[PDB]
From Swiss-Prot, chain B:
The chain holds residues 69 to 482 of 1205 of the full protein. L-arginine binds at Q170, W279, Y280, E284, D289. (6R)-L-erythro-5,6,7,8-tetrahydrobiopterin binds at S36, A369, W370, F383. Belongs to the NOS family. This is Nitric oxide synthase 3. It is found in: Cell membrane; Membrane, Caveola; Cytoplasm, Cytoskeleton; Golgi apparatus. Heme b binds at C107, Y398. It comes from the Eukaryota. Residues 32-403 are annotated as: Interaction with NOSIP. Homodimer. Interacts with NOSIP and NOSTRIN. Interacts with HSP90AB1. Forms a complex with ASL, ASS1 and SLC7A1; the complex regulates cell-autonomous L-arginine synthesis and citrulline recycling while channeling extracellular L-arginine to nitric oxide synthesis pathway. The lineage of its organism: Eukaryota, Metazoa, Chordata, Craniata, Vertebrata. Produces nitric oxide (NO) which is implicated in vascular smooth muscle relaxation through a cGMP-mediated signal transduction pathway. NO mediates vascular endothelial growth factor (VEGF)-induced angiogenesis in coronary vessels and promotes blood clotting through the activation of platelets. Zn(2+) binds at C28, C33. The gene is NOS3.
Length: 402, 403
């Protein structure tokens, strides 16, 4: 066969070769001696810029045209006299969509072409960031008919502070460290909760208190902004057949909006570019609610179901997890809030794999993140070999700003 | 250079230094990770592999650098220099087999690595003798349902000649009969091997759970067919603790998981036939064997029996049905008094193994995709555990099917 990785689907017996990986210009963590795939975590600028501009002109089918060459020349003159450059509006739209398309850990990529891109590169204060973020949340939420969106704030500048959203998501719940060492609310958010209190937030004392936004404009202390409650759509959790589930007082928010990632486009770095879609149900039902280091509700729910929690072989954990996941799907459906189950999501991702094979000759995908955290082998992606590599434009992790 | 390995449930960090002992490259590069791929795409070489292994052996018995150690290295050197090969002493073979198990990145059951019965069958000269050895292995391993880990090692590969091979991928598996209507009766994974048995003179059954005969091959000879005496093959009828109709599905599985198609590499020597067995983790049967779409694929049948809404994925009928099947497997083996481990118990014991190996060797090669169970992934501790994957020797490897 060809000298590119051969990729097999073990359910169907079908084979593809990935040629897209040859376009990767950035090393991952693996070597021939060891695989680290399971770990979670001017001259240079110009070559990344040229590459991105070539990508943009390919995408509009004007590669090698005089407009392509003039744009290249304009970019290197900008870099020559200023040390940086700036993207045209349509280049930014293309770049943000491409960064989503390129994200190996996202099972939702069948939607990549449908992204509302808000250009907020004229933002010049924390207050204005708040306005933009509120508008994003309003547009994205759309009273339950969720729409994928990203808002892009000004790029990093040489020896000048970054725009930063300190929250890891736009909507998340507080976690309060208790006197007895335990946590009330979401244990994932203890640090950010304590930082909001330092900066003058009067905290609640519930399990599901919406955090305020800590927003930072270049070279200034972060400023605190409470989201008006009418903007934060939430879903009370109930179960279709288990009547007591509603009595548990569980709830979750409708909008998953990642706010601490760096969007990189042609060497330019947007340190604040929060993006949002809609939930896949296992994110809430399995991870947020059942992780031992999160809300950890498995045992409480199994006790309500009268399961034998004293022994592993009753599969009490598996049974309670299924019902919690069902409650999430049912509650979001009842509230008319967009949500996708892990079966439909993974089916759509397989379609996406097929699309991308035809369009680009492959699709970078991180198998451990694509396969859902319950019922892995029951979904078609479990049986699909995947090649993981870094393409640009890309979303990247960045250090917490405190 | 040594990777940081973090557990995300607990916040704890270790460093894998064992990975520096790896002499054998896997499929990944800095450009792209190929970790999800199932299969991989002379004197001086053998001698250094041999020396390394002998050094491991004498080290393990705390006799590193002794007289016995030096004289043994000379024996190996003298034999390779004259013949191009050498032979292991039985105790070395025992150490090497356990080490290959210990080193196997895709095995969640490695807490048991030190407890392995090794049958030396390197004096085998016929398919007939292979059969007697396999039969003794099965009887020993099964032990009336109180399963004991075992390996039997047939003669090593030799430069001039064909391999000893077991054609079956497992000692015990069910036939798959391709039907006129294009469907498969029995196990679709075993259509090809079933057709080979028939072509070699097997009179086939026509059931869903027909135990295959063995096709055993001595060097450069046609394989020969041997039917396992039914009394040797322990099987478990599947029932459900609360759902009475489940027993009427007529479902069953065999007690003994026994891999027979992998190559055992020790000290540069290659054992092309070396079947090994332990006991089942229930998800192998309840989730993969019975529920895989390209296997028995019973999910939909079970869900309809449970009267679940199959018209829509969001009723989670697949998840619900899969749970009850796994429960049925667990209950049925426990009732039949046959050793089995559930995926929670197994993954908890694997975490303990990782801790043991950290202290003993400075790490543990592990393939995260294979260790995390196929249902209820993040509900097990291994989901939140980062893992480093690499090839240490002694090792079990895949080899081409002999046909
Ligand atoms: C439209 C519905 C969407 C669904 C169902 C979806 C689903 C997911 C899921 C399940 C993950 C794994 C997250 C985790 O477990 O930590 C993920 C990650 C990710 N998503 Fe999507 N997503 C959607 C939309 C979007 C959008 C609009 C963007 C940006 C334009 C995006 C970009 C990303 C990125 C960069 C990651 C990786 C984060 C990381 O590396 O930790 N997704 N997505
Ligand atoms: C004692 C109880 C044991 C349990 C519960 C157990 C469990 C498992 C499981 C669940 C797998 C993954 C299988 C798959 O999905 O294909 C596996 C693979 C493996 N096991 Fe263990 N095992 C046990 C004993 C043994 C023994 C005795 C040996 C050899 C001495 C062994 C060597 C291996 C090897 C080499 C693999 C990888 C096969 C491959 O790469 O396809 N295991 N084991
Ligand atoms: C846009 C979008 C849609 C969607 N359905 N889902 C998402 C991921 C959100 C929601 N549900 C989890 C959170 O993902 C947050 C991004 N990644 C977190 C993983 C991580 C990073 C660093 C250190 C760690 F330990 C872990 C985004
Ligand atoms: C010794 C032992 C104990 C245990 N519990 N479980 C086992 C694995 C056995 C049983 N249940 C599955 C089978 O695993 C067989 C090895 N894995 C096959 C993967 C494969 C897929 C496709 C092409 C290939 F070449 C290889 C062994
Ligand atoms: C250690 C392991 O890599 C880690 O727990 C990963 C596994 N797969 C995941 N997959 C998704 N989608 N999200 C996650 O947070 C994780 N966590
Ligand atoms: C493509 C993927 O690597 C393949 O389906 C693997 C995933 N993980 C697995 N894990 C185990 N234990 N057994 C398997 O057969 C597989 N299959
Ligand atoms: Zn890798």
């Amino acid at each position: 066969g060809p000298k590119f990785p051969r990729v097999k689907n073990w359910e169907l017996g079908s084979i593809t070769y990935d040629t897209l990986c040859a376009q990767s210009q950035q090393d991952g963590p693996c070597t021939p001696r060891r695989c680290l795939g399971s770990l979670v975590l001017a001259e240079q600028l110009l070559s990344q810029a040229r590459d991105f501009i070539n990508q943009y002109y390919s995408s509009i089918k004007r590669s090698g045209s005089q407009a392509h060459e003039e744009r290249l020349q304009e970019v290197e003159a900008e870099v020559a006299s200023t040390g940086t450059y700036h993207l045209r509006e349509s280049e930014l739209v293309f770049g943000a969509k491409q960064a989503w398309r390129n994200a190996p850990r996202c099972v939702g990529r069948i939607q990549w072409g449908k992204l509302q891109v808000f250009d907020a590169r004229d933002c010049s204060s924390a207050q204005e960031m708040f306005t933009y973020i509120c508008n994003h949340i309003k547009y994205a939420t759309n009273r339950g008919n969720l729409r994928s969106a990203i808002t892009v704030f000004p790029q990093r500048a040489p020896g000048r502070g970054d725009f930063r959203i300190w929250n890891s998501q736009l909507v998340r719940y507080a976690g309060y460290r208790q006197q007895d060492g335990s946590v009330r609310g979401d244990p994932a958010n203890v640090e950010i909760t304590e930082l909001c209190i330092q900066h003058g937030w009067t905290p609640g004392n519930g399990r599901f208190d919406v955090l305020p936004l800590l927003l930072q404009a270049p070279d200034e202390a972060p400023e605190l902004f409470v989201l008006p409650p009418e903007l934060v759509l939430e879903v009370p959790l109930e179960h279709p057949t288990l009547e007591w589930f509603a009595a548990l007082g569980l709830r979750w928010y409708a909008l998953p909006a990642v706010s601490n990632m760096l969007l990189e486009i042609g060497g330019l770095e947007f340190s604040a570019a929060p993006f949002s879609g809609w939930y896949m149900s296992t994110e809430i039902g399995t991870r947020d609610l059942c992780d031992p280091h999160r809300y950890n509700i498995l045992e409480d729910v199994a006790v309500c179901m009268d399961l034998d929690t004293r022994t592993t072989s009753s599969l009490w954990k598996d049974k309670a997890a299924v019902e919690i996941n069902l409650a999430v799907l049912h509650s979001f459906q009842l509230a008319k809030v967009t949500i996708v189950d892990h079966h439909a999501a993974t089916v759509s991702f397989m379609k996406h794999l097929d699309n991308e094979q035809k369009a680009r000759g492959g699709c970078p995908a991180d198998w451990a993140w694509i396969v859902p955290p319950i019922s892995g082998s029951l979904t078609p992606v479990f049986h699909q070999e995947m090649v993981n590599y870094i393409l640009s434009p890309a979303f990247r992790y960045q250090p917490d700003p405190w």
